[PDB]
Point group: C6
């Protein structure tokens, strides 16, 4: 399946980038 | 039922969420 | 089993609202 | 994959959390508008 | 199966995280109100 | 099926980091 897989892989990856950006926001607001 | 349709819309939203948050992170680095 | 379709639909709907608000937040911060 | 009852109720609580997160983000967007 | 019992643990961790996320966003919305 | 589980695991791990970042952001915004 390109559904249970492939789409879900892109979702998971978007979440990973969400987490990276939120850490960069947290770091800036420590600043 | 399929999830494929739904999971596609979710993934697309999460990519837009990712983009906006990178823009927020960039603005707060300014 | 495939009522998870309907729950996942409501999740995806919330993610779309999240995405929209984040666009407005990014615009305000930019 | 065995939902075995639970995964539907966990997925329900996830969806419920996302609805609350959407509400709070609307409030934050409002606050930041000024 | 292994897997089923995995999604037992995983879906629970996700749900727990989303609850924390919702709560911190409430606190952030409160802080940005003033 | 097994890999849907591994994707869901990656998502869950990212959501945990998102929660941790957000607690640091909430701490920074507290005053």
């Amino acid at each position: 399946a390109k559904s249970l897989k492939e789409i879900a892989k892109s979702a998971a990856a978007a979440l990973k980038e969400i987490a990276w950006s939120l850490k960069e926001i947290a770091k800036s607001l420590k600043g």
